[PDB]
Every structure is written in C-alpha cells, then in structure tokens.
Amino acid sequence: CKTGNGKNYRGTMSKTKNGITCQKWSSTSPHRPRFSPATHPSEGLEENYCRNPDNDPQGPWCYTTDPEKRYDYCDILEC
Ligand SMILES: NCCCCCC(=O)O
C-alpha cells in the first residue's frame, strides 16, 4: 500500500503485494520493463522498489525478475 506516496513504507524493500521478490530494474532480456523516465510524479525506483511513478494509486506497483511473476503491488503496510 501507499503508507506515503513518497514518505513512509516498509514492504517497499522488494516484494510484491503479498511478498513476491520484486526485481532490480534490470530489463526485459532476462525480465523487467524499461522504467526510469523523470516525467513521472516521483522515482523511488531504487534498484528493486515499488512506488507509483507511473499510475497506480490503488497500490505501489512493482514488477519482478520474471514473467509468471512479473508484477503486482508491494506488501507495504496498509495505510
Ligand atoms: N500502470 C502500470 C504500468 C507501468 C508498470 C510497469 C509495467 O507495466 O511495466
């Protein structure tokens, strides 16, 4: 969840909505989008994070090192 859309959180480590080990923002060759532009609200996409620099108020999104488990939000404490 967004216990602060750029202020406070915990599951932002690198785990999806439940706790699926997110990615490191590498790329689609192995597996990972091309996220990183500055025209985004923010950019807390630190190595392997979950935030909302795209458009997912419902919850901080985040992809992962693999397809079957490419994405979902982060297991960040509620808000
Ligand atoms: N609204 C989420 C789309 C951007 C999240 C990253 C991705 O989909 O590759």
Coordinates of C-alpha atoms and ligand atoms in Angstrom, one line a residue:
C1 CA 0.0 0.0 0.0
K2 CA 1.0 3.7 0.0
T3 CA 1.9 4.5 3.6
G4 CA 3.0 7.6 2.0
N5 CA 3.3 8.1 -1.8
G6 CA 6.9 9.0 -1.2
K7 CA 7.2 9.4 2.5
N8 CA 6.9 6.2 4.6
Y9 CA 6.6 2.5 3.9
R10 CA 8.1 -0.9 4.6
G11 CA 7.2 -3.6 2.1
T12 CA 9.0 -1.3 -0.4
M13 CA 12.1 -3.4 0.1
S14 CA 11.5 -5.6 -2.9
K15 CA 8.4 -7.8 -2.5
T16 CA 5.1 -7.7 -4.4
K17 CA 1.6 -7.1 -2.8
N18 CA 2.0 -10.3 -0.9
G19 CA 5.6 -10.7 -0.7
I20 CA 6.9 -11.8 -4.1
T21 CA 10.6 -10.9 -4.5
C22 CA 10.3 -7.9 -6.9
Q23 CA 13.2 -7.0 -9.5
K24 CA 16.3 -4.8 -9.7
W25 CA 15.0 -2.8 -12.6
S26 CA 17.3 -4.7 -15.0
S27 CA 15.4 -5.3 -18.2
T28 CA 13.2 -7.5 -20.4
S29 CA 16.1 -9.6 -21.6
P30 CA 16.1 -11.5 -18.5
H31 CA 12.8 -10.0 -17.5
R32 CA 12.0 -6.4 -16.5
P33 CA 10.3 -3.3 -18.2
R34 CA 12.2 -0.1 -19.1
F35 CA 11.0 2.1 -16.3
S36 CA 13.0 5.2 -15.2
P37 CA 11.8 8.4 -17.0
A38 CA 11.8 11.6 -15.0
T39 CA 8.4 12.8 -16.3
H40 CA 6.9 10.7 -13.5
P41 CA 5.4 12.0 -10.2
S42 CA 8.4 10.6 -8.5
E43 CA 11.0 7.9 -9.0
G44 CA 11.6 5.9 -5.9
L45 CA 12.5 3.1 -8.2
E46 CA 15.7 2.4 -6.3
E47 CA 17.2 -0.8 -7.7
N48 CA 14.3 -3.0 -6.6
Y49 CA 11.3 -1.0 -5.5
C50 CA 7.6 -0.4 -5.5
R51 CA 6.2 3.0 -5.8
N52 CA 3.8 5.0 -8.0
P53 CA 5.9 7.0 -10.6
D54 CA 3.5 5.5 -13.2
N55 CA -0.2 5.5 -12.4
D56 CA -1.3 3.0 -9.7
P57 CA -2.9 4.8 -6.8
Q58 CA -4.6 1.6 -5.9
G59 CA -1.2 0.4 -4.6
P60 CA 2.5 0.9 -5.3
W61 CA 3.2 -1.3 -8.3
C62 CA 6.3 -3.2 -9.0
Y63 CA 7.4 -5.8 -11.4
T64 CA 9.8 -8.8 -10.7
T65 CA 12.8 -10.7 -12.2
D66 CA 10.4 -13.0 -14.0
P67 CA 7.2 -13.3 -16.3
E68 CA 4.9 -15.6 -14.4
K69 CA 5.6 -13.2 -11.6
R70 CA 6.1 -10.0 -13.4
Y71 CA 4.2 -7.7 -11.2
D72 CA 1.6 -6.5 -8.8
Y73 CA 1.8 -4.0 -5.8
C74 CA 4.1 -4.3 -2.8
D75 CA 3.5 -5.8 0.5
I76 CA 3.8 -2.4 2.1
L77 CA 1.9 -2.0 5.4
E78 CA -1.6 -0.7 5.0
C79 CA -2.3 3.0 5.2
Ligands
LIG1 N1 0.1 1.3 -14.7 C1 1.3 0.4 -14.5 C2 2.0 0.3 -15.8 C3 3.5 0.5 -15.6 C4 4.1 -0.5 -14.5 C5 5.3 -1.2 -15.1 C6 4.9 -2.0 -16.3 O1 3.7 -2.2 -16.5 O2 5.9 -2.5 -17.0

